[PDB]
Each structure stands twice: as structure tokens, then as C-alpha cells.
């Protein structure tokens, strides 16, 4: 796979080549792949390869990454969340959105 | 979930409460759960809870566990494999079996 | 499971007995298994055991492995990719 605008990767803390889970709100499909950087400012979310069987242009998805850490750090951990609307317009809060 | 004769757990190196993958050769279903010890010598493989939607009595399955380790240890690692036939009769080799 | 020509495992850094993900371009199925070596130069990709329900002879697949490491290392990590066409001809 999934190519993603590098600005969106930065906001979510996701790394190029990192494992990602993709949860398709439109069709309910759930799959795991890895992230590819797309050009900054492109606003691209491209599902490539076998993943193209699981999502279509226009589908609304949640793209997540998971990391491991000891329990004590986990208990105060704050995920990096980016919220979208419209033409893949990114916001920092939920909470704003139609 | 999956309750498994403790002798079978010992042979495969699987621990009580360890995550396991179950691959159903009969019906093709693949699922992940955790191991429960059943009484030694019972020869039990019991699929419990939601897992009962994925396997039936008589189905042939492969039950696997995975561990993590550094690359150098991984390169010479030998999995613990137990082979079955008949009335869940365990063998150490493949290789013997109808 | 999946038996894979050793040359291909060498190119991708995939180990015998390593967990692998298989993503089937032909039919869309996605599953997780482990790698077995096949004879070097055979160009074999054999789906064994339950995994035979998820792929057929001739299906095009992507086979991947994943590793863990600290964030500082992950920022510059480079995966080992091998590209194929035709009858499993590498490059």
C-alpha cells in the first residue's frame, strides 16, 4: 502492497516498509500488508498487488501500525492518529469532520 | 480454544497458554487461538469456543507454534515436530505413516 | 507448508522454518505458513498441507517475511526483494 503519501506516514508515525493492517470500512475486508512511501503531497493511497482484491478506489479504510514495548511504557503510550475527510484532507482531531 | 494432550504438547514443545495456529487440512480453514493442556495420555484435541465453527470431530489439522529469536539462532534452529496417524498415535518421524 | 527453491530463499533472505505470508494475486486469498527449502535451481514453489486449499498450480503469489527491530534501525532498514516473471525466472 500500500503506497501512502509520505506526509500521511509522518503524521501516523508509520515507516516505509513497516507492516500495516488495513480495515476496509466500506466492504468489511481486513488484511495485512506493508507500507510504501508515495510522493509528499500526492495524497495517494494505492492498493497494489494481491491487495487490490480487497479494496477499490473510493473505499474508506483505516490503516494501522502496531509496535511492541514493555508493559510500563504501554500503560502510558499515546498512538499517533490522523483523521481524514474530503479529498484525503488530513486533520489532527476527530472532531471537525462530517 | 484448543485443549491438547500434555504428551503432544511436550513433543511439539508447545506450552499451556501459548498462541497456536491451526490449519485444517480437511476443510482449508486457518485460525489462531491458544493451547490448553488436556490430561496426559488422553489423546484429546478439543476445539472449544468460537473455534468450534472452524473444525469438526474427525478433521485432520496441523497445530503450530512460532517463537522469535535473533537471526543467527534462527539460521540453525530445529523445530520440534510430532507426526500422527491412526488414533492420534504419535511418531517422531514422517516417514512410517500411511 | 510452502517449499521454495533455495536460490529464491537466498535472494529474499527467507530462512527455512521462518514464518511467511502468502498473498495470492490470482484469487486474492491471503494466508500465513512457514518456508521449506526446495532443491536449488528447481524453480519450485509448492503449496503443501492445508495451504493447498488456498493456491492452485499456476496462481501468481507474493511471498513475504517480516522481522522486528528497534525503531532507530527500522528507519533505515532495506528489505530483500526478488522479482520474477514467466516460469519463475528471477529478474
Amino acid at each position: 502492497x500500500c503506497a501512502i503519501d509520505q506526509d500521511f506516514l509522518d503524521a501516523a508515525g508509520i515507516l516505509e516498509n513497516e507492516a500495516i493492517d488495513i480495515w476496509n470500512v466500506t466492504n468489511g475486508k481486513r488484511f495485512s500488508t506493508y507500507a510504501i512511501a508515495a510522493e509528499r503531497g500526492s495524497r495517494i493511497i494505492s492498493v497494489n498487488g494481491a491487495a487490490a482484491h480487497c479494496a477499490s478506489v473510493g473505499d474508506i479504510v483505516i490503516i494501522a501500525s502496531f509496535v511492541t514495548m514493555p508493559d510500563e511504557e504501554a500503560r502510558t503510550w499515546r498512538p499517533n492518529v490522523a483523521y481524514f475527510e474530503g479529498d484525503n484532507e488530513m486533520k489532527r482531531t476527530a472532531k471537525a469532520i462530517p | 480454544x484448543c485443549a491438547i494432550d500434555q504428551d503432544f504438547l511436550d513433543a511439539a514443545g508447545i506450552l499451556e497458554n501459548e498462541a497456536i495456529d491451526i490449519w485444517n487440512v480437511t476443510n482449508g480453514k486457518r485460525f489462531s487461538t491458544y493451547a490448553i493442556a488436556a490430561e496426559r495420555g488422553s489423546r484429546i484435541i478439543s476445539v472449544n469456543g468460537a473455534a468450534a465453527h472452524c473444525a469438526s470431530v474427525g478433521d485432520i489439522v496441523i497445530i503450530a507454534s512460532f517463537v522469535t529469536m535473533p537471526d543467527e539462532e534462527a539460521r540453525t534452529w530445529r523445530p520440534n515436530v510430532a507426526y500422527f496417524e491412526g488414533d492420534n498415535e504419535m511418531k517422531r518421524t514422517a516417514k512410517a505413516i500411511p | 507448508x510452502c517449499a521454495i527453491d533455495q536460490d529464491f530463499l537466498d535472494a529474499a533472505g527467507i530462512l527455512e522454518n521462518e514464518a511467511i505470508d502468502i498473498w495470492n494475486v490470482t484469487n486474492g486469498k491471503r494466508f500465513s505458513t512457514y518456508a521449506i527449502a526446495a532443491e536449488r535451481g528447481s524453480r519450485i514453489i509448492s503449496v503443501n498441507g492445508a495451504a493447498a486449499h488456498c493456491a492452485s498450480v499456476g496462481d501468481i503469489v507474493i511471498i513475504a517475511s517480516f522481522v522486528t527491530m528497534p525503531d532507530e534501525e527500522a528507519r533505515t532498514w532495506r528489505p530483500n526483494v526478488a522479482y520474477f516473471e514467466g516460469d519463475n525466472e528471477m529478474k
Binding site: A19 | - | N48, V57, N88
Partner: peptide
């Protein structure tokens, strides 16, 4: 302390050559 899961490597667009439901190994 934060550990990432990263793509280690991949075989891109290989074709399945054999299928063996009854494999013994």
C-alpha cells in the same frame, strides 16, 4: 524500547508449481 515489524524480504510474482494436500513433512 519501541520495536517495529518490518518487511524482511519478498518473492514478487512467483507462480505456484505444485500443490500437495497430503504432504507428510
Amino acid at each position: 524500547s519501541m520495536i517495529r515489524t518490518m518487511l524482511q524480504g519478498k518473492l514478487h510474482r512467483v507462480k505456484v508449481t505444485h500443490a500437495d494436500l497430503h504432504y507428510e513433512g
